[PDB]
Structure formats: structure tokens, C-alpha cells
Design a protein around this ligand. Structure first.
Ligand SMILES: CC(C)(COP(=O)(O)OP(=O)(O)OC[C@H]1O[C@@H](n2cnc3c(N)ncnc32)[C@H](O)[C@@H]1OP(=O)(O)O)[C@@H](O)C(=O)NCCC(=O)NCCS
Ligand SMILES: [Cl-]
Ligand SMILES: [Cl-]
Ligand SMILES: [Cl-]
Ligand SMILES: [Cl-]
Ligand SMILES: [Cl-]
Ligand SMILES: [Cl-]
Lengths: 720, 71, 159, 6
């Protein structure tokens, strides 16, 4: 090699080995002798571990073969590149946009934050015990503080992933490349004072170009980003630094068009993947975002997380976990923070209740009956795991239910053997609600194929019937207890002063003070649950009717229409409903019940008799959609009004906007089902009349502004 | 035999300047090597790479420490 | 075009090299020699190639499929399709479908209870092939692949 | 398609 150091280094490459012997000739001779299929390895060693291996001289698998431009190859961190103000502001700008790409865009740490040569230089000094001195204040002080503040944010992210709240290298990548800063990294106050000192330098600085104004906001943004650890260490609920982060990011977004930024070449590169220890294949650097809109998303997502602290009942925390991450997937930082903010270190929920007391509130508000048991201890753990599953990504969210359904079922059956009716009832509600949620979530993930829509929509309709039946019986008992208390009041007006009246007034006043308020609240909550579950039940029945109409014309079937030679329709069906196979109540209907129910829905007639039954099915879809729209409108009304109007209790005080937004999209999807039903009819009737008929297929289409638990079964021409 | 070599540190020289130091995990009939705890040395620079497999055509020289060889 | 389907010959070096080169270009996830070595040396009966008899080099396989089988849990044998690729100039001729048929037929004769594979949700060509054979989607994996795309886990139940 | 994992 031409470089002197490489020449001098090659002399002492193998100096730690006193005597080396060429065994290349011996290896070749023995390997030629061996059979082509044989592999020499430790018999205990598993060959599956070899699949995780990198390969030399493999462009996809070799980090060393990465190609670098001249500017990237050297780039001494000590050189102050001209112009200093424009370059420092451009370096600091790209670093922030590297963090957004890492967290918001789920990109890898080495190709984002560690891609900067400055951050590598700083962390290497921290591993030992600023890291570079350039002679220029902007790079030495203003830029040195920016790198320190970002490296501090990464360490805080490591503390979050250490909790195992979210899955690593899926929701968030933390490939530290072997870095361990230990306790050497300074404290939050020191990092903040460094950034604050740099801001004061800029105010005194003479150059008044737009780059200075943007560099001030970049220092301010890092300051407000460092304050993110305040919500975990101190459980801060103050939106002061989250609002400053939003105001700072708004000011920079209007600054990007007025000026063009280009950092010194070689500042951000794949250099670190080439000359630092790396057990992973090389990776290109994905295009960074053009604006700071990620910090606004992150700041808004964290503000939402802190709102759960303001909850005053179990139902308010329950609906928060049900709506804060339902419409779209929240920022990974916010998703990790919620269980850590909810389930605190002191083994308390939000610092207010213990794990068992928090569980008892859910049973109390659901049953309206006043309550170190091992079943209570286990159910409490199960409830917290249910809360933590709500903050998982849209795919893991469904997979979490696959594990809960059998533990809820086992727990319920354990409550049943001891004849604990209240806890068995509540567990049944969580188990059955999860089965419906688990099933319907598959449509949002396009899990089921169009031929499977009937099986799943009718099964949910089957489940929704059982849940409505259960909730209605619960509400009748609740109303029964209310009427009993109302009966004591009537019995007191017709009574005269006496010993027997004093016993009744004492009984009545006890029930009004300790029971009536909860009875009314639980009843009104069950009223909302009944409207919520009938919207589910109706929508499912609309989907089944739509499917049945499609099969009536011969356009779809509840089995795979393509001929296969290895499986049958029953085996495929049992595999689809495998998760619900071991659950006893409600039992999974047999394969025969699925087949017979569909044949009842399918219009077997032809001609004018067909027209009457077809109009009957379409008339139901159009009328039920309007019924669904009215139920959603009534729910949306109660949400706007609150939980003190006397009819509906929704517990949506903390997620009011999200809940109305959810039901709005649910209303959009409902109207789409009615419109689609009419298009399908006018098309198929005309297609049958025409002797040349298009070949149609059905696809599960998602409404752009609707709820994709109920996709639109849409006709489409095959063509070529 | 080739068996006893498994699990013993070896030195592998590639076509370029870089040299791989690792422990032989496995060997196939075409003398493709699987090495764990691989340390890559390019002149003065050195770095870790973990589990690496090297094709026969990439291997220029296979050296072992003579003491470890006799051990 | 005269497509011939035959099992992999473990001693042949060119078949091995052609399979790897074919799979490396067409598949996005990178594989080392020992990925193929784990499949081919342990399940040599579960890899099939498609060659063109009328081609300029009849020995070179234009399509291949790489599979394996292991007990899943304790009571079931789970066949697994690791790689499947067909040359760009040979696509649209039913070659991949035949390779998947002969491999699943092989795994079924070996008393597999199910077949499993992972494919990209954006890979419509592969989804149509398997779902057309009875495969259904059992799982969606968030950003499963190196290219950050989601994956579907497809399972075909045989018993 | 089998996925690579470290
Ligand atoms: C997928 C791939 C192997 C197809 O090869 P092929 O020989 O053209 O496939 P076939 O000719 O056997 O097609 C058979 C079935 O597969 C589907 N199929 C194949 N190509 C398709 C395409 N563009 N679009 C939709 N379906 C397609 C069809 O349903 C087709 O059924 P049909 O014959 O009734 O129309 C090839 O495109 C490829 O190499 N893709 C990248 C690698 C990959 O897909 N791996 C899958 C994960 S293991
Ligand atoms: Cl509840
Ligand atoms: Cl309540
Ligand atoms: Cl009990
Ligand atoms: Cl639920
Ligand atoms: Cl079928
Ligand atoms: Cl054959």
C-alpha cells in the first residue's frame, strides 16, 4: 500500500504471533479428499448458526468493500471547513434530521446518528473518559454542545429499550456498534448548560445571516429534546418543553425554503461501517426528511401519553389505552414511554394505585359491586400486560391477543371452578372483547383473503351476539338493583314514623351513598357498550350479506377457487380458526355450521324470484347502514357532552378528539358499504343481461378515511 | 485430522491487504471456511466482525501459530 | 423452451454455484455460502432445479427452490420453503409453480403436516402463487425484511 | 424468502 502507516502496520500485523506456519497446502489436500456433501464441524455445534454469518468479497455482506469518496475517506474532525457558520448550521441540521430518520422513519442507528463523524469522535472519547479542537468557536463550542446533546438523547433511548417495552430492531433500532459510554457521559444539567452557553455565544456573534437564526433554533431544539427524560425520571406532566419544541420546529420549517444547506463533504458517510467493528452487512443511508415535522409528531405523541395521568377512573385509563394508538401508529419514543409512565418503578399504576387495587377498579366499575389472593394477583398481571400490548405496533398489537386469549380463557375457567361470579364475568368480558378485536384486526392487516371474509365477519357476528347477550344480562341485573333502591324510596313515603321506618331509611340512605352512583354509572357504561357492540354486530351482518350477494351471482366462494392438489377446504378452515379452538365459551362453531349458515344466506333461486330476494338483501344493507350511522351519531353526541348527561358513559375524556375521529371514520366506512352495495347490484344485473360478461373478482379495499376493520368488498375486472 | 482444527484459532490471508483472525467453526468439501470471533486487520487498522464465512477463492494463505499447531 | 425438473445433485459444484448466483440476484435478503450449506447439505432431497433442455447451457438451472423440514413444537412436522427464484427470461411460464408443487409433494411424502414460508406483502407475484395453491396468511410481520417491507407468514395445512 | 438475521 502507498500509505506509510499501512506499510509500517503490515510489518507488525502478526507480531503477537511468534511463529506462523503455512497450512494452506495441508487444508487443500484434506478438503479435496473429503466427500462433497460432508461438513467438518463440532458435532454439538448447530449449522443453523452459520446462517447468521457475513461473507467476504460479497458486496451485500462485506463491510470492508464499501466504496468511499476522497472527502469521506479523510475528513479530519479538527479541520474547520469554510464557511464555518453555514457548515456548522448544516452539520447540526442534518444531525437532527438523522435522528428523525432513525426514530420516526425506523432507520438504523449506524446509518443515521452514528453516520456523523463528529458523534463517533465524541463517543470514542467518552468510552475512554472536547473530543476535537478546531480553533474555531462555532465547531469547538457551538457544534461540540450539539453533538453532546444528541449523544445524551441516544443514551436516554437506550434506557427506554432496556425496559423491553417494545421489540428491538423492529419498532426501534439500537445498534450501538459495541459502544459503552458507561457513566462517563455527563449529566442532564451539564449538557443543558453547554447548549445554553452556546446560545449566548450566538447572540453575541456578529454574523446576522439566516444560518445564525436557524442555528439558534437547532440549539433550542436539542435543549427541549434533552428534557424528554424528565417524563420518566420525574414523571413530568408539563407540556412546557414539548410546546417549545413545537414552536422551534415550526420556525425552522419556514426557514428551509429560504436557504440551501450542504454540510462539508464526508461529514455524514458510511465510514463508520467500514473501519469500526460491525457484525452486520453494509447499509446505504436512506434519504433524510426535508423538514422538522418529525419533532412535531414526536412532541404531540408525548403530550398525548402524559394525558393518562389525568384519568380519575379505570374506564378513563381503559379508553385511553383503546384510542391513543388506534387511529395510527404513534412515535416509538411515545409508545415506550406509556407503559413506563403507566407502570412505574414503585410498583404502582401512575403513582396512585397498586397493581391489585388497579385491577379491582376495573371489576368494580364493570360490575357495580363493592369488593392477597393468588387469582387476583394473576389477573392483575394479566391486566397490566393487556395495557402494555396497546402500545405495540399495528402488527404486534394483533399478535399480543393471540397469547392473551388462552390465558384469559384459563383464568376465567379457574374463577369458574371456585364459583367467583364477579371475576369470572369480568374476565369473560375481556376475553370475548379481545377475540372480537383480534379477529377484526386481521382485516386492517389484510390477513384474510376475500374468500375468507364471510367466515370471519360471521364469526365476529357470532361473537358479537354472545357479547351483547352477556352485556344485556349484566345490565338487567344492574337495573334490577337500581329498581330495588327505588322501591325503598316509594316504601318510605307511604310509611309513618316508627322503628320499622327508621330501619328502611337507614337502609335506603346506605344504598344511595355507597351503591346508587356506581349503579347508574355502570348502567350508562353498559348502555354505551350495547350501542358499541350492536354497531359491530350490524356491520358484520352487512358484510356477510354483501358476501352472500356476491356468491349468489357466482363471483366469490367461501373457499379457495383456484384448484389445489395438497389441501382441502376443511383443513384450511380449521387452520384459520385455530387460535379459537381451545376456548370453551363461546365454543367455536363447527365447520358444518359455517357451511350451512352460508347456504341459508345464498339466494338459490333464479329469475323474478331472485329479484325479490336480492332486493330484500340490499334493502337490509341500505337500512342497516343508516341505523349504524344513527348509533354512531348518538355515541358521538355523548362523547361531546360528557359522562354526566345521564344516558351514555364512554370514559373518553382523555381521548375525546381521537374517539370522535374514530367514529367519524367508522361512519365513513358505513356509508361506503351502502354505496358499494348499490354499485354491485347495478353492475351484476347488467352483466347478466349482457351475453358477453366481464370476469370480475373481489378485493378487500380499505376506505382512505374509514375504519379498515370493515373493508369494502369491491368488484374489479381481471383483464390481463 | 481436519476435525481437531475445529475450535482452534487460525489466521487467514485474503487477496487484499486485510487479514482475518478467527476461530475455525466449520469447513466444507470446497475448503470454504466458517470463522467465529473474526478480527480483521488492514495494515495498522484492526476491527472485529463476528461470524464470517470465506470462500475458497478469497483465501490466499492459511497460517496457524506454530505452538498452537503443535499443541 | 424445454423445461426439465430434477432434484439437486449435492456433488455437482456447478449446480450449487448456479443456484447461489440465481438466488442472490433475484432475492433481496443476502445469503452467505453457509446459508445454502445449511439447507442443501442437510436436506438435499428438498431442493429442486429447473433446467432448459433446449438452452445454450442445458445444465445451468434457470429456476430453483430450496426447502427444509423440522418438527414444529413436538407433534407436527413443518416443511419450510426458504428460497424460490426463476430467471427473469423464464418467468410467466409456470416454472416456479411446478417447482413449488414438486417440493410440497416431496415434503408431503416425507409426512410433513404443514408448509410454511415468509414473503413480502408487496410481492404480489409470490402471494398469488401460494394462495392459489391453498396457502393462507397467518401473520403479518412489521418491517420483517432488510428492505424495511412487511412480511406475510404463509401456511399450507396438509394434515 | 428466508430473512437474514445477525
Ligand atoms: C415469483 C417468481 C419465482 C415467479 O416465477 P414464475 O415462473 O414466472 O411463476 P409461474 O409462471 O409459475 O406462475 C404461477 C402462479 O404464480 C402467480 N404468478 C406468477 N407471476 C405472477 C405475477 N406477476 N403476478 C401475479 N401472479 C403471478 C400466478 O397466480 C400464477 O398463476 P397462473 O399461472 O394461473 O396465472 C419470480 O417472479 C421471482 O423470482 N420473484 C422474486 C423471488 C420471489 O418471488 N420469492 C418468493 C418468496 S419464497
Ligand atoms: Cl373495565
Ligand atoms: Cl364506570
Ligand atoms: Cl376469588
Ligand atoms: Cl380488548
Ligand atoms: Cl381449497
Ligand atoms: Cl422430479
Amino acid at each position: 500500500p502507498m500509505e506509510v502507516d499501512s506499510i509500517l502496520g503490515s510489518l507488525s500485523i502478526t507480531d503477537d504471533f511468534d511463529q506462523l506456519v503455512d497450512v494452506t497446502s495441508l487444508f487443500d489436500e484434506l478438503c479435496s479428499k473429503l466427500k462433497p456433501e460432508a461438513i467438518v464441524k463440532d458435532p454439538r455445534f448447530d449449522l443453523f448458526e452459520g446462517t447468521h454469518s457475513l461473507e467476504v468479497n460479497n458486496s451485500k455482506l462485506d463491510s470492508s468493500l464499501i466504496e468511499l469518496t476522497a472527502e469521506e475517506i479523510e475528513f479530519d474532525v479538527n479541520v474547520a471547513y469554510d464557511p464555518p457558520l453555514a457548515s456548522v448550521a448544516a452539520i447540526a441540521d442534518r444531525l437532527l434530521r438523522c435522528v428523525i430518520s432513525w426514530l420516526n422513519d425506523y432507520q438504523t442507528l449506524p446509518t443515521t446518528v452514528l453516520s456523523c463523524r463528529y458523534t463517533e469522535s465524541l463517543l470514542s472519547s467518552l468510552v475512554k473518559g472536547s473530543s476535537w479542537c478546531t480553533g474555531n468557536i462555532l465547531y469547538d463550542k457551538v457544534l461540540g454542545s450539539c453533538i453532546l446533546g444528541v449523544c445524551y438523547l441516544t443514551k436516554f433511548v437506550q434506557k427506554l429499550l432496556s425496559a423491553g417495552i417494545v421489540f428491538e430492531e423492529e419498532d426501534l433500532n439500537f445498534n450501538n456498534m459495541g459502544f459503552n459510554t458507561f457513566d462517563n457521559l455527563p449529566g442532564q444539567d451539564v449538557v443543558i448548560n453547554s447548549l445554553t452557553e452556546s446560545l449566548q455565544i450566538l447572540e453575541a456573534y456578529s454574523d446576522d445571516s439566516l444560518h445564525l437564526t436557524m442555528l439558534k433554533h437547532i440549539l433550542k431544539i436539542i435543549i427541549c429534546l434533552v428534557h424528554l427524560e424528565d417524563h420518566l425520571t420525574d414523571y413530568s406532566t408539563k407540556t412546557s418543553h414539548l410546546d417549545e419544541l413545537i414552536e422551534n420546529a415550526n420556525s425552522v420549517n419556514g426557514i428551509f425554503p429560504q436557504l440551501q444547506l450542504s454540510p462539508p463533504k464526508g461529514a455524514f458517510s458510511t465510514y463508520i461501517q467500514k473501519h469500526r467493528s460491525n457484525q452486520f452487512p453494509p447499509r446505504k443511508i436512506t434519504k433524510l426528511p426535508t423538514d422538522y415535522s418529525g419533532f412535531i409528531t414526536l412532541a404531540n405523541d408525548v403530550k398525548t401519553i402524559l394525558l393518562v395521568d389525568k384519568a380519575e377512573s379505570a374506564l378513563e385509563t381503559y379508553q385511553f389505552a383503546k384510542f391513543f394508538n388506534k387511529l395510527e401508529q404513534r412515535h416509538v419514543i411515545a409508545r415506550i414511554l406509556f407503559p413506563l409512565f403507566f407502570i412505574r418503578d414503585d410498583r404502582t399504576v401512575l403513582g396512585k394505585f397498586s397493581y391489585t387495587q388497579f385491577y379491582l377498579l376495573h371489576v368494580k366499575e364493570f360490575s357495580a359491586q363493592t369488593p392477597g389472593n393468588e387469582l387476583i394477583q394473576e389477573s392483575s398481571n394479566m391486566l397490566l400486560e393487556w395495557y402494555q400490548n396497546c402500545s405495540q405496533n399495528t402488527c404486534r398489537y394483533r399478535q399480543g391477543f393471540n397469547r392473551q386469549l388462552i390465558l384469559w380463557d384459563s383464568l376465567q375457567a379457574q374463577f369458574e371452578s371456585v364459583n367467583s361470579q364477579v371475576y369470572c364475568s369480568w374476565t369473560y368480558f375481556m376475553k370475548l372483547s379481545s377475540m372480537i378485536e383480534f379477529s377484526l384486526k386481521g382485516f386492517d392487516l389484510d390477513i384474510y383473503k376475500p374468500f375468507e371474509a364471510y367466515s370471519m365477519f360471521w364469526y365476529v357476528y357470532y361473537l358479537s351476539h354472545h357479547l351483547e347477550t352477556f352485556l344485556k344480562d349484566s345490565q338487567n341485573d344492574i337495573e334490577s338493583n337500581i329498581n330495588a333502591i327505588h322501591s325503598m324510596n316509594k316504601k318510605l313515603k307511604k310509611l309513618k314514623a316508627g322503628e320499622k321506618k327508621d330501619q328502611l331509611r337507614l337502609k335506603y340512605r346506605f344504598a344511595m351513598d355507597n351503591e346508587m352512583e356506581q349503579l347508574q354509572a355502570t348502567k350508562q357504561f353498559l348502555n354505551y357498550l350495547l350501542k358499541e357492540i350492536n354497531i359491530t354486530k350490524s356491520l358484520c351482518l352487512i358484510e356477510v350479506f354483501q358476501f352472500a350477494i356476491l356468491k349468489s351471482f357466482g363471483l366469490i366462494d367461501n373457499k379457495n377457487s383456484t384448484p389445489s392438489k395438497f389441501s382441502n377446504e376443511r383443513l384450511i378452515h380449521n387452520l384459520r380458526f385455530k387460535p379459537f379452538n381451545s376456548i370453551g365459551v363461546p365454543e367455536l362453531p363447527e365447520y358444518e355450521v359455517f357451511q350451512q349458515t352460508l347456504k341459508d344466506f345464498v339466494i338459490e333461486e333464479k329469475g323474478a324470484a331472485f329479484d325479490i330476494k336480492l332486493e330484500r338483501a340490499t334493502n337490509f344493507i341500505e337500512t342497516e347502514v343508516r341505523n349504524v350511522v344513527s348509533s354512531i351519531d348518538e355515541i358521538m353526541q355523548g362523547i361531546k357532552g360528557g359522562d354526566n348527561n345521564g344516558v351514555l358513559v364512554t370514559g373518553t375524556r382523555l381521548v375525546q378528539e381521537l374517539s370522535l375521529e374514530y367514529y367519524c371514520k367508522l361512519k365513513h366506512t358505513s356509508k361506503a358499504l351502502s354505496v358499494n352495495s348499490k354499485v354491485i347490484v347495478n353492475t351484476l344485473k347488467k352483466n347478466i343481461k349482457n351475453k358477453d360478461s366481464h370476469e370480475y373478482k373481489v378485493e378487500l379495499v380499505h376506505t382512505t378515511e374509514g375504519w379498515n376493520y370493515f373493508p369494502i368488498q369491491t368488484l374489479r375486472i381481471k383483464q390481463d | 485430522k481436519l476435525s481437531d482444527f475445529i475450535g482452534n484459532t487460525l489466521i487467514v490471508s485474503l487477496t487484499e491487504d486485510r487479514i482475518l483472525v478467527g476461530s475455525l467453526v466449520a469447513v466444507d468439501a470446497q475448503m470454504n471456511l466458517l470463522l467465529d470471533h473474526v478480527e480483521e486487520r488492514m495494515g495498522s487498522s484492526s476491527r472485529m466482525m463476528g461470524l464470517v464465512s470465506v470462500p475458497r477463492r478469497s483465501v490466499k494463505t492459511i497460517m496457524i501459530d506454530k505452538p498452537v499447531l503443535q499443541e | 423452451m424445454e423445461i426439465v425438473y430434477k432434484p439437486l445433485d449435492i456433488r455437482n459444484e456447478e449446480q450449487f454455484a448456479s443456484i447461489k448466483k440465481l438466488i442472490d440476484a433475484d432475492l433481496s435478503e443476502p445469503y452467505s455460502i453457509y446459508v445454502y450449506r445449511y439447507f442443501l447439505n442437510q436436506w438435499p432431497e428438498l431442493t429442486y432445479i429447473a433446467v432448459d433442455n433446449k438452452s445454450g447451457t442445458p445444465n445451468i438451472p434457470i429456476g430453483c427452490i430450496v426447502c427444509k423440514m423440522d418438527p414444529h413444537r413436538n407433534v407436527r412436522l413443518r416443511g419450510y420453503i426458504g428460497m424460490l427464484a426463476v430467471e427473469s427470461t423464464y418467468r410467466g411460464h409456470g416454472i416456479a409453480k411446478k417447482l413449488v408443487e414438486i417440493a410440497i409433494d416431496k415434503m408431503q411424502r416425507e409426512h410433513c403436516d404443514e408448509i410454511m414460508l415468509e414473503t413480502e406483502v408487496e410481492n404480489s407475484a409470490a402471494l398469488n402463487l401460494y394462495e392459489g395453491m391453498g396457502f393462507i396468511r397467518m401473520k403479518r410481520m412489521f418491517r420483517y425484511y432488510l428492505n424495511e417491507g412487511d412480511a406475510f407468514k404463509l401456511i399450507l395445512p396438509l394434515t | 424468502m428466508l430473512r437474514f438475521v445477525g
